[PDB]
Amino acid sequence: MSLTEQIEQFASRFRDDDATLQSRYSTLSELYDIMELLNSPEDYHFFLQAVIPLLLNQLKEVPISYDAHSPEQKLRNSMLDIFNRCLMNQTFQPYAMEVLEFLLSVLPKENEENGILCMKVLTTLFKSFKSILQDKLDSFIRIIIQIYKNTPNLINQTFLRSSMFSFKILSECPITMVTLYSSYKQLTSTSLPEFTPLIMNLLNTSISTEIINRPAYCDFILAQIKATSFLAYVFIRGYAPEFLQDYVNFVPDLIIRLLQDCPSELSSARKELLHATRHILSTNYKKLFLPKLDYLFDERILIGNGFTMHETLRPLAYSTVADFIHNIRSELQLSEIEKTIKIYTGYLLDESLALTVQIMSAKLLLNLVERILKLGKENPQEAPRAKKLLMIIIDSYMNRFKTLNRQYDTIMKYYGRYETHKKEKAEKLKNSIQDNDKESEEFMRKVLVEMFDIKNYAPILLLPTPTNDPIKDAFYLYRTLMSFLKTIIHDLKVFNPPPNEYTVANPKLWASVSRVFSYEEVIVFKDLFHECIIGLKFFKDHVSATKDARELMDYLAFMFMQMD
């Protein structure tokens, strides 16, 4: 049935849908019963020349009346998602001349399903353009411009759903961008309601909810914000072909504003909002003026609105903020460095999120130790204040090891499962069809504590239990953090007090190893040695030691050689 044989399946239904209330299976369900999935390398055109007049006569009727609850909306959406399912390699203009007349009719109206063809039919004409060029690039692109001119009327009538994701980008764009600049600037740099400046009088700071009950509808802000996040996502692509002008300092305040008023009732828009933020911050010159205008203080947990979907957007947002902070590394004075290690040590010691984010936070503190050393080498007056910072971050390393060791026996329970789920998954592999080890002998011999575990018994699990190797993750964490600790403890040798007070006969031995510490620093060093000795129980058998335990013992020995 991959031929013309489908036509006699609806040759009796070749006539139009008369009495469209109960005729919901006659003509519209031709791509729905069986004739939608069969193979068609060059089998479409045996019936594709019958679909276009049939669907054309379907689209001649069924007018723009949207308010009635489906006397005709069913077949309307049926031909709508017929138009997306069809893939063609020929006769593109018979498709194109019969779709524009409806999208040129729903310019100012968007309420009660008023013209939701457009975000599908413009994408299908984009797909047919990307198959082969139809030299029609100045006709269909004007309708979205008139949408943009209608948006002042749309904001004045509300005292939306543009969906511009592929609507202006065609991967070549041999056109102007100034009209695109004006259509972006007519809605970006405006107060999106007339009430957002008057909620900043209570800023002493941040708004969790979008608006405190000022708009009665409360669904226009949701759609308008969604569309604003769409456009804030889509103007990033423009930066690479040509430099954007006429405004350069207007993006950071709108970024902070859109991060402040994303709704807590949805979580999809924050994904591409943070994606647009990291696509801005992946550049070279845009990431310089942005930390000044946010002041690195609106880059906190305000970006998680509603605490039931700020658990999947955690690693993305933390990785983008840390990547940008590692990218600047020169604008930072000591106060911003204190403020960022104070939050990233908390990200490291947070048990609720993944291991990779904790490793990334430890890597960020290791990247900041060079800026701390250089800033302390600049002015010696704050040279104690830098040195105590180097006793904060390694203290968090000592805490992280401690957070592993208390889970020790619990980890062992999962390791027991990681034996059995491996042991029953390697003895099902010896059932292979291979030979030369059985037919050879056949031919020859024929002639002759549940504390962390309580989270895993919740009735709403929300995530499957992991089956990865816990000892491999423990060895990864121990090796990475002990290499970082060796680096920072060796780098602490530049903050020694001058040896004239101790008046040693050999100051050439000083400023290399011998130094001083306070009481609350040698307590941290004692607990570090204690936790590193305890942590060698993960790497036993389960001068006769394993290789990973021997490597960690070399790290622990070399870590304490450069201490005083």
Binding site: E36, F307, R406, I433, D435, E450, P459, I460, L461, V524
Partner: protein
């Protein structure tokens, strides 16, 4: 000053066995006001914040506070007062210092019954707005932790309530459950942590999954509470509410209309973040939906709903959730057939990534339907998919086994097109092992002998300058092909193939200059000797020649024990040496070739070898 006061009090309690106060607790409250005052002083004046010594002092203060709290007669108020103490600041929990005390709080079976009292003023701490949302979230931690600890390592709510004796907090939970009306004032009152509503949802899920039969007057409040969560706009709360209402309507109190509504709401518009939730929800809901839909005969529309939603989002990524919806239960199927063409087209479109393990579980579904019986074009469609997948490259061996069972229930030579060419040769060899074995199953492989002869002529002459795995894996299909009951009643059709492969062994044994030509002759001579008693008996002296070459480069690997690199290409020579032993030994019809062969055998006993074939040659001397 705070560190000095804390370690002075810690020294005064260390020098005695127990509290110097003798569990009085008046200087400890003075230390609590000391901590609040130094936190306010460090928050107003911005001089030097978040030190090492501040954190160590707070750790010591929590240690002595929780040391006093486990050493008193009224443990119920100062624990919640400690939760008040760090409402504004100071961490979210003392990790394995406060939670260790709470894990002591969860005593097994509540013999003392202090914990039941704790749960009482705990839920009074929850309902009263005497603190911010973070400490009520820690109250979620303690309450739900002792509840699911009594659920897990005991009977499910068998010790707390026995004949409605001392509930003592469930009526407070009734007062809590009744306030849910008007969206539990979520819009009216601003709460910024959504862990509270998830706490309440999980608490209802504890009561539903634990024991819904001893309680019967609470159930309407339970279902209206878990149904008010449906009408929200978030996704994970919505699917958790779907999960808990499917828990309830799988337990008992079954309605007729809305179970299909929650079913079609479950299997429609489910994105990536809530896949495990809808997996658990469908795996709980559908075995009772099957048995309560079939209470009346003709309603079987719950397959038609899956068909409608499967053809709705056609050829997209969200269909895969339905593709392994029908794979986790299977006994509620083999009643439809358009499913088969649907999943065959889906696996043929998804094979060309990393979701290959999905598609095999599609095919493993189909065979499970076929053995359930004990179309036509779809047979050759799925076998062409299986052959193309196994020659496109664990789970490929599962594809091998499933095609081997499926053939016996394309059948033309397609492998003429089969660097990665040697890998395609090996996968083609593994395919032709069984696809020649599973057709014409009366030892009837003679009609296609010229076609398969020209197919395998480009790989029986393989090992001239390339790897050994091609011959070592085509050996099995040659061993299957050259057993055709001999040529004594049939026409000489296998006989030209036998003469051709024996002259190939001849011309490859005339090449003795490298260690690649010596393998083909001994392998094909061994399969001819295994599958036929007659072999090249006038041409047995090149086997002696290659045996002597094997001895004289065993002399080259005598003074080293092993190779540093390329270790396999010595033990495979030892393996084909064990081949050539029995091959030149089991026939004793040699001419003048017996004495140099026996002198090489004595030389093999002479120098240092491995025991595993020295025992083979002493068994051969025993024969």
């Amino acid at each position: 000053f705070f560190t000095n006061m804390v370690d002075l009090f810690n020294t005064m309690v260390i020098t005695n066995g127990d509290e110097w106060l003798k569990k009085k607790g008046n200087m400890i409250l003075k230390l609590k006001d000391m901590l609040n005052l130094t936190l306010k002083t460090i928050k107003e004046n911005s001089f030097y914040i978040d030190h090492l010594q501040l954190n160590q002092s707070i750790a010591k203060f929590q240690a002595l506070y929780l040391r006093f709290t486990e050493l008193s007669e009224r443990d119920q108020n100062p624990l919640l007062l400690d939760f008040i103490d760090f409402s504004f600041s100071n961490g979210i929990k003392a990790s394995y210092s406060l939670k260790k005390f709470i894990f002591h709080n969860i005593i097994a079976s509540s013999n003392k019954e202090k914990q039941n009292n704790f749960i009482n003023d705990a839920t009074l701490f929850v309902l009263s707005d005497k603190c911010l949302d973070a400490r009520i979230f820690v109250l979620k931690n303690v309450i739900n932790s002792t509840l699911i600890y009594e659920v897990a390592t005991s009977g499910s709510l068998k010790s707390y309530l026995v004949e409605d004796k001392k509930p003592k907090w469930l009526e407070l939970l009734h007062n809590k459950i009744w306030k849910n009306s008007n969206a539990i004032l979520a819009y009216d009152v601003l709460d910024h942590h959504d862990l509270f509503r998830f706490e309440l949802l999980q608490l209802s899920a504890i009561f539903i999954k634990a024991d819904p039969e001893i309680i019967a007057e609470i159930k309407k409040d339970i279902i209206k509470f878990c149904w008010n969560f449906i009408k929200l706009e978030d996704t994970l709360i919505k699917q958790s509410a779907y999960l808990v209402t499917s828990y309830f309507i799988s337990k008992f109190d079954f309605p007729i209309k809305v179970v299909t509504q929650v079913f079609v709401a479950l299997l429609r518009s489910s994105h990536v973040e809530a896949r495990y939730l809808v997996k658990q929800s469908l795996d709980v809901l559908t075995p009772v939906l099957h048995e309560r839909m079939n209470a009346a005969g003709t309603p079987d529309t719950w397959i038609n709903w899956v068909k409608r939603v499967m053809v709705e989002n056609s050829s997209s990524q969200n269909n895969i959730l339905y593709q392994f919806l029908i794979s986790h239960p299977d006994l509620f199927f083999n009643s439809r057939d358009l499913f088969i063409s649907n999943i065959i087209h889906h696996m043929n479109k998804i094979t060309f990534s990393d979701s290959h393990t999905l598609a095999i579980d599609l095919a493993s579904l189909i065979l499970y339907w076929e053995n359930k019986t004990l179309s036509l074009h779809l047979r050759e469609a799925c076998t062409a998919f299986l052959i193309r997948y196994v020659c496109a490259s664990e789970l490929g061996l599962r594809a091998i086994n499933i095609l081997s069972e499926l053939i016996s229930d394309v059948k033309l030579v397609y492998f003429e097109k089969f660097s990665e060419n040697i890998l395609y040769y090996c996968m083609n060899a593994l395919d032709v092992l069984y696809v020649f074995f599973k057709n014409k199953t009366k030892e009837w492989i003679m009609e296609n002998l010229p076609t398969i002869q020209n197919l395998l002529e480009k790989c029986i002459k393989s090992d001239h300058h390339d790897v050994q795995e091609a011959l070592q894996k085509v050996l099995q299909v040659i061993m299957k092909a050259i057993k055709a009951q001999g040529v004594s009643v049939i026409i000489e059709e296998e006989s030209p193939g036998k003469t051709f492969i024996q002259m190939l062994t001849s011309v490859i044994t005339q090449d003795l200059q490298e260690t690649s030509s010596v393998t083909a002759g001994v392998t094909l001579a061994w399969v001819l000797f295994m599958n036929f008693p007659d072999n090249i008996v006038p041409l047995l002296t090149p086997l002696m020649k290659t045996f002597s070459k094997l001895c004289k480069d065993h002399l080259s690997i005598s003074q080293p024990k092993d190779a540093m690199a390329l270790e396999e290409a010595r033990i495979t020579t030892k393996l084909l040496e064990k081949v050539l032993y029995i091959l030149s030994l089991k026939v004793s019809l040699l001419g003048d070739s017996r004495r140099p062969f026996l002198s090489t055998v004595a030389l093999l006993i002479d120098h240092s070898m491995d025991q595993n074939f020295l025992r083979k040659i002493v068994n051969m001397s025993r024969s």
